[PDB]
Design a protein around this nucleic acid. Structure first.
Ligand SMILES: [Mg+2]
Ligand SMILES: [Mg+2]
Ligand SMILES: [Mg+2]
Ligand SMILES: [Mg+2]
Ligand SMILES: [Mg+2]
Ligand SMILES: [Mg+2]
Ligand SMILES: [Mg+2]
Ligand SMILES: [Mg+2]
Ligand SMILES: [Mg+2]
Ligand SMILES: [Mg+2]
Length: 73
RNA sequence: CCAGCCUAAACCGUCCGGCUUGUCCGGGCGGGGUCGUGGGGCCCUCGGACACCGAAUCCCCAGCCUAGCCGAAGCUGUUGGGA
């Protein structure tokens, strides 16, 4: 099973990552310990918006301090 | 004997709660949609309301069921316990 994991995990990967486990690992450890969540299409999508909306949250807090470079220099 | 229909999904509005507040995610209601000459969603351009079609639902009636009622035309002998 593939999960997205909410915490950097040794052999696995870092947070936010989507990785393939053996279900046993997922259903009996990852999932239970809340260290990861099911790669549901219902959640790969809930990652589209976590992804884009902290990317444009700085794909604009840079487009903003760019004027402080237009006239404060 | 005769007859065909409703939906799920995209898509839109909504209300609720979950939260890492996100143009999201999930659940509920509504709309939308229902097909194989493929169909629907969405986006463009066009004539449709007064078009007509129409129930398997509902309303009234007829008819029927559960009691009934009307209904024609004969009398005398005669054997016989009795016609
Ligand atoms: Mg196995
Ligand atoms: Mg969705
Ligand atoms: Mg979506
Ligand atoms: Mg419906
Ligand atoms: Mg949807
Ligand atoms: Mg919606
Ligand atoms: Mg309102
Ligand atoms: Mg409908
Ligand atoms: Mg009108
Ligand atoms: Mg009719």
């Amino acid at each position: 099973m593939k999960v997205i994991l909410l915490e950097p995990l040794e052999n696995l990967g870092d947070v936010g990552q989507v990785v393939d486990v053996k279900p046993g690992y997922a259903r009996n450890y990852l999932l239970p310990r809340g260290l990861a969540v099911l790669a549901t299409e219902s959640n790969l999508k809930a990652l589209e918006a976590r992804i884009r909306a902290q990317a444009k949250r700085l794909a604009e807090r840079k487009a903003e301090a760019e004027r402080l470079k237009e006239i404060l220099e």
